[PDB]
Ligand SMILES: Nc1ncnc2c1ncn2[C@@H]1O[C@H](CSCC[C@H](N)C(=O)O)[C@@H](O)[C@H]1O
């Protein structure tokens with residue numbers, strides 16, 4: 001009901017703290033595939049039996065564990081995803097989004113709404129990507145966090161978009177190559193390029209080699225404000241434009257239009273907000289993502305009209321917006337050069 | 341699904357921050373019964389139009405508002421409950437549970453689980469009730485917060501428990517008298533007493549007079565560690581025992597047994613945890629309540645077996661546990677003196 005929903009929302013931060021503790025204490029990996037005794041687990045994470053038992057009971061109450069017998073715990077499917085070693089692990093995603101770096105800025109949300117610029121810079125002393133360039137461990141966590149988030153998109157995009165017409169695809173800000181890898185796996189003849197910062201490009205190059213795609217997927221580093229590597233039939237930009245304000249987005253789309261030339265297409269893979277806000281079944285709430293982009297980066301999520309206008313300016317026109325399965329929350333916006 | 345549920349939980353703290361902003365900026369009261377333009381609302385709370393629009397869109401995405409047309413907002417039933425002036429308002433509940441006093445202790449959850457004692461004392465310099473005795477404004481907020489929480493119980497208890505056999509009912513730690521008022525309203529011949537701290541007793545006395553129950557509801561102040569006023573047929577103790585550790589609970593139940601004498605009954609109105617933890621449909625998660633009691637007070641929620649043992653010790657026996665409608669989350673534990 002109306003009261004239950006409100007009460008749920010209000011206790012959200014306490015629920016997050018319970019999940020944060022599970023992740024920080026690596027309890028998912030400690031439990032693993034079996035039934036674990038709380039007394040055995042207590043001598044793994046430096047908590048006493050009583051304290052750990054109360055935390056595990058909360059995690060069972062939140063659908064992350066099962067208490068088969070008093071003091072005996074197994075993971076649910078949800079709990080399994082917080083294992084470091086799970087094939088679709090969101091452990092790094094969980095650690096990143098519960099780290100002081102991503103949560104402290106939210107304590108100052110009203111200031112971000114008042115100033116219209118991020119509170120991250122005030123707390124940590126530089127813009128997020130400048131900061132991560134100086135903190136390799138956070139940069140590594142971020143790369144693995146974005147891999148975890150992008151799995152839902154990577155596992156669905158090729159069944160919702162026809163990649164067969166293209167010889168070459170370049171992923172602009174393509175992270176560790178999670179998205180392009182998934183596309184290349186389904187198209188053996190297709191050639192890929194990941195365009196990233198020098199720091200993340202190191203991660204992508206290792207991922208491409210480890211995945212055995214080095215023969216037909218290359219990695220190139222630079223600044224998408226400077227240029228996007230030319231020559232490709234298709235360009236992807238996923239979860240990238242929402243990191244930047246309108247003028248910075250135009251500059252990225254400007255670099256993209258130069259690379260598109262005559263027979264180049266751009267696929268913007270991002271939240272497409274409705275003109276009228278309403279509840280959304282996406283695994284991550286798109287309006288919470290919007291405010292995340294504000295406090296961390298001074299970015300935002302955008303409507304089709306808002307993006308259509310930013311395209312228009314870049315000498316680009318939104319051709320067509322294609323949906324993904326509703327749990328994903330992202331859409332595929334096809335962008336081509338404007339008649340002019 | 342399993343991934344969607346986990347993603348939901350992880351973004352809980354950001355959802356809480358969105359609701360906290362709505363409450364702090366009094367946006368619910370600003371919107372009220374009508375459709376409000378974001379530009380008009382912007383000149384009420386010292387946020388610019390763009391910033392406020394993004395917050396309201398998030399609140400619409402979380403089911404608190406409706407965006408009927410771009411920039412035009414009305415409350416949902418859920419949003420209406422954050423109005424100060426709503427007859428079943430949880431505004432004070434929302435402000436209390438998003439205040440630094442109740443949230444900062446959660447940043448140190450692991451320490452509370454390790455030490456087994458509250459982190460509130462470390463942050464704010466004294467036990468919670470000692471602190472609130474020195475902070476009248478927080479004490480007032482707390483009284484109104486507990487009223488908001490107790491509405492679900494107050495509105496159902498008399499239809500799930502027969503109060504007709506009793507001439508007199510005493511509410512031990514009865515807050516502002518929300519629970520006893522609801523019971524007395526349905527039993528015109530019934531006489532009530534609220535037993536509270538001197539500070540909260542002032543609130544209860546005013547509430548009883550305002551409600552026109554002064555003729556058959558009295559307020560008496562003291563310390564339930566010292567005694568509980570005698571002479572009553574029935575004693576209630578709601579959301580009180582969970583505030584205290586096992587030995588402090590025994591001392592409260594000891595005071596209760598003295599007051600019960602020969603023909604006295606005790607009704608413990610509290611979460612009754614299952615032996616095996618599992619998901620719960622209650623408006624407030626009982627395991628999150630358990631950890632709230634730890635970090636704030638060094639208290640806990642308890643199973644029937646755990647309470648049965650604390651009763652046994654107090655010279656009391658749990659007679660019978662009666663359920664409330666599932667959204668409430670509390671049960672009615674009938675406690676009588678032990679044969680001995
Ligand atoms: N100036 C710049 N030039 C190129 N890449 C940049 C950049 N500033 C940020 N980036 C990259 O932009 C990415 C945005 S995060 C999205 C990563 C990936 N597309 C995914 O969806 O999982 C980061 O990996 C970051 O390294």
Ligand SMILES: Nc1ncnc2c1ncn2[C@@H]1O[C@H](CSCC[C@H](N)C(=O)O)[C@@H](O)[C@H]1O
Nearest residue numbers: 486490513514515536537540563564578579
């Ligand atoms: N030593 C003490 N003696 C009496 N009351 C006390 C006390 N310590 C705390 N309390 C009271 O115990 C109450 C617990 S909160 C629960 C209030 C009410 N029964 C409800 O459910 O809404 C507070 O109102 C607080 O003032």
